[PDB]
Design a binder for this molecule. Structure first.
Ligand SMILES: CCCCCCCCCCCCCCCCCC(=O)OC[C@H](COP(=O)([O-])OCC(O)COP(=O)([O-])OC[C@@H](COC(=O)CCCCCCCCCCCCCCCCC)OC(=O)CCCCCCCCCCCCCCCCC)OC(=O)CCCCCCCCCCCCCCCCC
Ligand SMILES: CCCCCCCCCCCCCCCCCC(=O)OC[C@H](COP(=O)([O-])OCC[N+](C)(C)C)OC(=O)CCCCCCCCCCCCCCCCC
Lengths: 50, 74
């Protein structure tokens, strides 16, 4: 239920939260070929799961 | 006498003018109610306006509440 959006201003500064989110690979797609891919996380994404 | 009957007949010739006077009186009694309701309109619609307009319309008295969050980032 948690997204990085939740940490900025309430706990941490925005810049640091963006840098935290960048540490993870998050899956996204489909692309033009209908395949899925991975990208660096962004402020709008939910926490990852193991 | 014709003269007196004419005066009595004519006494009410100006009905419409008296009715306009009545309009004036009742509206004068009524119209101040616009101030309470105007204040409440503005009360409700103030937080919808831009922050700059809130600051301006209160001659700079109003400012963003300070609740201890969302401070500057060095
Ligand atoms: C003290 C001793 C004790 C005495 C005891 C006596 C007994 C009485 C008590 C008195 C004691 C104090 C008590 C406390 C009371 C106050 C607290 C209170 O009430 O809070 C409430 C409180 C509300 O809190 P809130 O809403 O969060 O408050 C946020 C603020 O309002 C913040 O909101 P905001 O900032 O967004 O507000 C906006 C505001 C912002 O306000 C301001 O910033 C105004 C600043 C004010 C300054 C003050 C000036 C006066 C002082 C000056 C000093 C003078 C000096 C001289 C004297 C000293 C020296 C001689 O601006 C406006 O309102 C609009 C502006 C004005 C509009 C008019 C238009 C004018 C245009 C101007 C024209 C001029 C040109 C301008 C253009 C520019 C270009 C030129 O209640 C709650 O939180 C809710 C409670 C839950 C209950 C729910 C109710 C029931 C619902 C259920 C219904 C469902 C059931 C069905 C129906 C049932 C029916 C029965
Ligand atoms: C006869 C009058 C009958 C009145 C009945 C009206 C009842 C329903 C009112 C709904 C108002 C909705 C306004 C739409 C805009 C979006 C609101 C909103 O949440 O914005 C975000 C804002 C906060 O913004 P924000 O932080 O989300 O980000 C956007 C920033 N701004 C707003 C600057 C763009 O939330 C609010 O402040 C809540 C809206 C309060 C406005 C209430 C208006 C009440 C209207 C009654 C006045 C009647 C006067 C008499 C008129 C009669 C004339 C004949």
């Amino acid at each position: 239920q948690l997204h990085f959006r939740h940490l900025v201003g309430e706990v941490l500064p925005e810049k640091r939260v963006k840098q935290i989110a960048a540490e993870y690979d998050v899956t996204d797609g489909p692309n033009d070929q209908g395949e899925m891919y991975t990208r660096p996380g962004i402020l709008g994404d939910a926490f990852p799961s193991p | 006498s014709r003269a007196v009957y004419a005066k009595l007949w004519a006494s009410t010739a100006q009905y419409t003018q008296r009715r306009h006077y009545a309009w004036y009186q009742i509206w004068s009694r009524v119209i101040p109610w616009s101030v309470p309701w105007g204040i409440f309109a503005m009360w409700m619609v103030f937080p919808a306006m831009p922050v700059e307009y809130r600051q301006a319309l209160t001659f700079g008295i109003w400012q963003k509440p300070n609740i201890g969050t969302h401070g500057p980032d060095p």
